[PDB]
Amino acid sequence: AFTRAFLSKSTVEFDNFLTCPLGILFTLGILLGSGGAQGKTGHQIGKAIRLKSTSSSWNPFGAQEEMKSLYKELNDSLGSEKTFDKEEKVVRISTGLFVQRTHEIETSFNESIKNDFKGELIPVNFLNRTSATLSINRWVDQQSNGLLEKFFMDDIPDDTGMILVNVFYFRDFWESPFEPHYTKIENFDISPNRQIKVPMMMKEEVLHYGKFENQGFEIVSKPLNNTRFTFVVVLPLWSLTGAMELLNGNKILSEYIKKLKETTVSLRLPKFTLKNTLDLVQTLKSMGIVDLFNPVAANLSGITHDHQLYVDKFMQTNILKLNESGIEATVLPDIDFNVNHPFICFIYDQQLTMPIIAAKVIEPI
Secondary structure, three states: OHHHHHHHHHHOOOOOEEEOHHHHHHHHHHHHOOOOOOHHHHHHHHHHOOOHHHHHOOOHHHHHHHHHHHHHHHHHHHHHOEEOOOOEEOEEEEEEEEEEOOOOOOHHHHHHHHHOOOOEEEEEOOOOHHHHHHHHHHHHHHHOOOOOOOOOOOOOOOOOOEEEEEEEEEOEEEOOOOOHHHEEEEEEEOOOOOEEEEEEEEEEEEEEEEOOOOOOEEEEEEEEOOOOEEEEEEEEOOOOHHHHHHHOOOOOHHHHHOOOEEEEEEEEEEOEEEEOOEEOOOHHHHOOOOOOOOOOOOOOOOOOOOOOOOEEEEEEEOEEEEEOOEEOOOOOOOEEEEOOOOEEEEEEEOOOOOEEEEEEEOOOO
């Protein structure tokens, strides 16, 4: 499927990885759905999303409406999820199309991104590359409510090309938070040679466990306050590559989630924060979208019909900060589950059954 294709060509890029293939879809749903990407260009997108209408033949009108409802379907769902003592959105997704101001955008394309998607068109001047970058930095700093300030893009396109940015943010409490009285400082076996300290978080409770001496990666799942989403940690029994097979899409996660039984667990978990800016232009080509990031052969006539443009940079930026209290929020055990060497964690969806956020941690920040 899509999420299983993305993690394939995204994880081969590695060191501390952090990606959210959930919203990257959203970034690109806003290309097909609105009607921006026509021809070969947008067809290659529908195909990579593996949707019905692209299965048989190019049919422009058709794949727009099916992406528009597919997006809108998943989009109110992650929005229908509200957590606290004032109700707050649990999932947070902004998606930004930064474009040369001079271009007469089609009023249909502009009508759709506003009333059809939750996303935002930003008209800026790339000639003023200096003033151009800060516009982006102010945009992302305004969307992440300060969590992701200091995002500075090293290079800018020469007038025709575009820049997309996607900011996923997942905020929630634990279902059973950690006592800070027991968050002590402990070693973390990075390698034989380097070992660092970190604030380990010790709690014992009933959590769904799973050992797989089959592959070599034991599994734990801690649910958040909103029980639909679970936080999953994958520990090797230091094999390391045995776990990644889950991370690059060779192994379905749910497939493994399903064998997790109620257990008592002595959980010791590092306090850490993961932030990780990524470019998906060399990823979305190897995954079958190569006619979009190319100036000669990109067809974004749905946006403008006076000057030809393409996508220069497809940027993503994420923040995962774990605390005793939850994620971004401030009993006799039968299983020990100490996490002091590198691991692979997920924010798993229990309804959509997909890992919205899949991360590989080498050294905890």
